[PDB]
Structures are given as C-alpha cells and as structure tokens.
Motif scaffolding. Structure first.
Motif, PDB file in Angstrom:
ATOM      1  N   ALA A  39      59.476  23.325  32.560  1.00 54.37           N
ATOM      2  CA  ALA A  39      58.669  23.903  33.629  1.00 54.37           C
ATOM      3  C   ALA A  39      57.600  24.837  33.073  1.00 54.37           C
ATOM      4  N   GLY A  40      57.893  25.522  31.963  1.00 54.85           N
ATOM      5  CA  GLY A  40      56.850  26.271  31.278  1.00 54.85           C
ATOM      6  C   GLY A  40      55.784  25.366  30.685  1.00 54.85           C
ATOM      7  N   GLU A  41      56.190  24.209  30.155  1.00 56.75           N
ATOM      8  CA  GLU A  41      55.231  23.337  29.496  1.00 56.75           C
ATOM      9  C   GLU A  41      54.297  22.698  30.514  1.00 56.75           C
ATOM     10  N   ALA A  42      54.830  22.282  31.664  1.00 55.15           N
ATOM     11  CA  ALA A  42      53.958  21.787  32.725  1.00 55.15           C
ATOM     12  C   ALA A  42      53.092  22.905  33.302  1.00 55.15           C
ATOM     13  N   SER A  43      53.585  24.150  33.280  1.00 55.55           N
ATOM     14  CA  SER A  43      52.763  25.282  33.708  1.00 55.55           C
ATOM     15  C   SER A  43      51.538  25.420  32.825  1.00 55.55           C
ATOM     16  N   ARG A  44      51.739  25.297  31.512  1.00 55.00           N
ATOM     17  CA  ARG A  44      50.636  25.382  30.568  1.00 55.00           C
ATOM     18  C   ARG A  44      49.705  24.200  30.706  1.00 55.00           C
ATOM     19  N   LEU A  45      50.264  22.993  30.807  1.00 55.31           N
ATOM     20  CA  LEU A  45      49.440  21.834  31.120  1.00 55.31           C
ATOM     21  C   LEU A  45      48.566  22.125  32.333  1.00 55.31           C
ATOM     22  N   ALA A  46      49.184  22.624  33.413  1.00 50.51           N
ATOM     23  CA  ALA A  46      48.456  22.877  34.653  1.00 50.51           C
ATOM     24  C   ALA A  46      47.290  23.834  34.434  1.00 50.51           C
ATOM     25  N   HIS A  47      47.483  24.850  33.595  1.00 51.48           N
ATOM     26  CA  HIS A  47      46.405  25.768  33.266  1.00 51.48           C
ATOM     27  C   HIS A  47      45.693  25.403  31.971  1.00 51.48           C
ATOM     28  N   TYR A  48      46.065  24.285  31.331  1.00 54.77           N
ATOM     29  CA  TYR A  48      45.302  23.757  30.195  1.00 54.77           C
ATOM     30  C   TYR A  48      44.004  23.095  30.655  1.00 54.77           C
ATOM     31  N   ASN A  49      44.087  22.118  31.560  1.00 57.64           N
ATOM     32  CA  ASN A  49      42.986  21.972  32.502  1.00 57.64           C
ATOM     33  C   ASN A  49      43.071  23.147  33.477  1.00 57.64           C
ATOM     34  N   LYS A  50      42.086  23.344  34.341  1.00 59.83           N
ATOM     35  CA  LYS A  50      42.260  24.489  35.228  1.00 59.83           C
ATOM     36  C   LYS A  50      42.824  24.097  36.589  1.00 59.83           C
ATOM     37  N   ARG A  51      43.629  23.035  36.639  1.00 62.75           N
ATOM     38  CA  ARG A  51      44.280  22.626  37.878  1.00 62.75           C
ATOM     39  C   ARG A  51      45.235  23.704  38.376  1.00 62.75           C
ATOM     40  N   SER A  52      45.253  23.891  39.693  1.00 62.24           N
ATOM     41  CA  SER A  52      46.164  24.849  40.301  1.00 62.24           C
ATOM     42  C   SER A  52      47.590  24.317  40.358  1.00 62.24           C
ATOM     43  N   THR A  53      47.748  22.996  40.423  1.00 63.21           N
ATOM     44  CA  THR A  53      49.000  22.363  40.807  1.00 63.21           C
ATOM     45  C   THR A  53      49.750  21.840  39.589  1.00 63.21           C
ATOM     46  N   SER A 102      65.519  21.043  46.783  1.00 58.51           N
ATOM     47  CA  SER A 102      65.024  22.273  47.394  1.00 58.51           C
ATOM     48  C   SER A 102      65.261  23.480  46.487  1.00 58.51           C
ATOM     49  N   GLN A 103      66.413  23.512  45.818  1.00 68.50           N
ATOM     50  CA  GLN A 103      66.750  24.658  44.976  1.00 68.50           C
ATOM     51  C   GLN A 103      65.936  24.640  43.693  1.00 68.50           C
ATOM     52  N   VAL A 104      65.704  23.451  43.140  1.00 68.02           N
ATOM     53  CA  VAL A 104      64.893  23.329  41.940  1.00 68.02           C
ATOM     54  C   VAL A 104      63.459  23.766  42.216  1.00 68.02           C
ATOM     55  N   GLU A 105      62.927  23.406  43.388  1.00 70.19           N
ATOM     56  CA  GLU A 105      61.566  23.833  43.719  1.00 70.19           C
ATOM     57  C   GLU A 105      61.517  25.328  43.978  1.00 70.19           C
ATOM     58  N   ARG A 106      62.608  25.887  44.498  1.00 70.22           N
ATOM     59  CA  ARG A 106      62.656  27.317  44.755  1.00 70.22           C
ATOM     60  C   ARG A 106      62.714  28.093  43.447  1.00 70.22           C
ATOM     61  N   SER A 107      63.472  27.596  42.466  1.00 69.60           N
ATOM     62  CA  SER A 107      63.423  28.185  41.129  1.00 69.60           C
ATOM     63  C   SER A 107      62.033  28.048  40.505  1.00 69.60           C
ATOM     64  N   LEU A 108      61.341  26.936  40.766  1.00 67.80           N
ATOM     65  CA  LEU A 108      60.012  26.740  40.187  1.00 67.80           C
ATOM     66  C   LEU A 108      59.039  27.790  40.688  1.00 67.80           C
ATOM     67  N   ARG A 109      59.084  28.086  41.979  1.00 72.78           N
ATOM     68  CA  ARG A 109      58.084  28.964  42.553  1.00 72.78           C
ATOM     69  C   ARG A 109      58.447  30.435  42.427  1.00 72.78           C
ATOM     70  N   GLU A 110      59.730  30.773  42.294  1.00 68.73           N
ATOM     71  CA  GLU A 110      60.062  32.149  41.947  1.00 68.73           C
ATOM     72  C   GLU A 110      59.839  32.420  40.468  1.00 68.73           C
ATOM     73  N   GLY A 111      59.496  31.392  39.697  1.00 67.21           N
ATOM     74  CA  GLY A 111      58.972  31.578  38.364  1.00 67.21           C
ATOM     75  C   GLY A 111      57.467  31.701  38.292  1.00 67.21           C
ATOM     76  N   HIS A 112      56.769  31.567  39.425  1.00 66.06           N
ATOM     77  CA  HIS A 112      55.305  31.684  39.486  1.00 66.06           C
ATOM     78  C   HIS A 112      54.621  30.754  38.486  1.00 66.06           C
ATOM     79  N   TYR A 113      55.199  29.567  38.264  1.00 63.44           N
ATOM     80  CA  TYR A 113      54.735  28.679  37.199  1.00 63.44           C
ATOM     81  C   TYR A 113      53.301  28.205  37.402  1.00 63.44           C
ATOM     82  N   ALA A 114      52.788  28.251  38.624  1.00 62.24           N
ATOM     83  CA  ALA A 114      51.416  27.852  38.929  1.00 62.24           C
ATOM     84  C   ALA A 114      51.103  28.339  40.336  1.00 62.24           C
ATOM     85  N   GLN A 115      49.911  27.996  40.818  1.00 63.10           N
ATOM     86  CA  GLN A 115      49.557  28.222  42.211  1.00 63.10           C
ATOM     87  C   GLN A 115      50.455  27.553  43.242  1.00 63.10           C
TER      88      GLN A 115
END
Length: 170
Positions: A39-53, A102-115
């Motif tokens: 999830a960190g690596e996809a976060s960096r990918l997401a901000h490697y291009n400047k995609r929000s998602t 639902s729980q995996v997505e909730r962990s993703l967003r409480e990690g602020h991994y992206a927009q």
C-alpha cells in the motif's frame, strides 16, 4: 487486528487444522507488513505520476514490484479474479473473499495513502493478501499434516516461510 480473516482462510485451506496463538500473531504480523509494503508502494506510484487516486493498477504494479514474480503472477491473477468477479455483480462477498474489503479500504484511508481510492482497489488488495495468507497457511498446514499434528505451531510457520524459494523473499 486481522486475525479473524486469517483463521477463516485457515479453515478453507485446512478444515481441521488449528494454529498456536503466537503462530497467529506471526500471521498477523505478516499481513500487516505485506499490507504496509504494497500500500505504501502504490501510494508512491500514485504520487510518482501526480494522480490523486490509488487504483487497482497501482496495487497491481506494487504487487509485481514486490513479489518474486512466479508468486506475483498468481497474486496478480488472484487480484484480477476478485475484481472482475466483483464487477459482474455483499461487498466482500461479491468479490468471493474472506478478507473484508470494507476493512481493508478503511485501513487504506486511515493511512492517508493518497487522496482517494477506487472502490475496486481494496478488493484487489484484499485478494492479494488473502492469497499470500492462504499460501502460507496452505503449505504450513501441510507440513503439520506431514508430521502428524493438528495445529500450525510457530516453528512450523517459520520453517515453511523460510525453506520455500519465493516465500523466503517475504
């Protein structure tokens, strides 16, 4: 904690096999490590291009960016199954997994991994984690049955995660 999903996955690969309590903590540690990494690596990918998602494909590239690539193949194959099988149609159920979407997505967003994330991204990530969890529990549960025991002990876990080509990478 994620312990319920691990146990539920254990009941599917091995209906009559149990697990010592710190072998389970070991499994919970693995889940959270492998979740943090992908999830960190996809976060960096997401901000490697400047995609929000962070979307399914950031996960997927993270997957092929972290796993040894016969393992990554089956993992990306599994996460793609969960996605197409979720589109056709609940929540977790439509994806046909035991790890809660639902729980995996909730962990993703409480990690602020992206927009923000596609709803198809935690399904892919729950599919991947469920797959590696099922692989570890599958082999370990097997070495238990090979040695005449009904429970996965912590030392069986570690001689299984080591002593395996790909899994030792993790």
């Amino acid at each position: 904690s994620y312990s319920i999903y691990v146990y539920k996955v254990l009941k599917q690969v091995h209906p009559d096999t149990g697990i010592s309590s710190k072998a389970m903590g070991i499994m919970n540690s693995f889940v959270n490590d492998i979740f943090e990494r992908i999830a960190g690596e996809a976060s960096r990918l997401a901000h490697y291009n400047k995609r929000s998602t962070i979307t399914s494909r950031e996960i997927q590239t993270a997957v092929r960016l972290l796993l040894p690539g016969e393992l990554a193949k089956h993992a990306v194959s599994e996460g793609t199954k969960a996605v197409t099988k979720y589109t056709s149609s609940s929540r977790t159920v439509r994806a046909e997994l035991s790890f809660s979407v639902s729980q995996v997505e909730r962990s993703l967003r409480e990690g602020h991994y992206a927009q923000r994330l596609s709803r198809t991204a935690p399904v892919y990530l729950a599919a991947v984690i469920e797959y590696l969890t099922a692989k570890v529990l599958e082999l370990a549960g097997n070495e238990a049955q090979n040695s005449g025991e009904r429970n996965i002990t912590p030392l069986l876990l570690d001689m299984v995660v080591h002593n395996d080509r790909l899994l030792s990478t993790l």
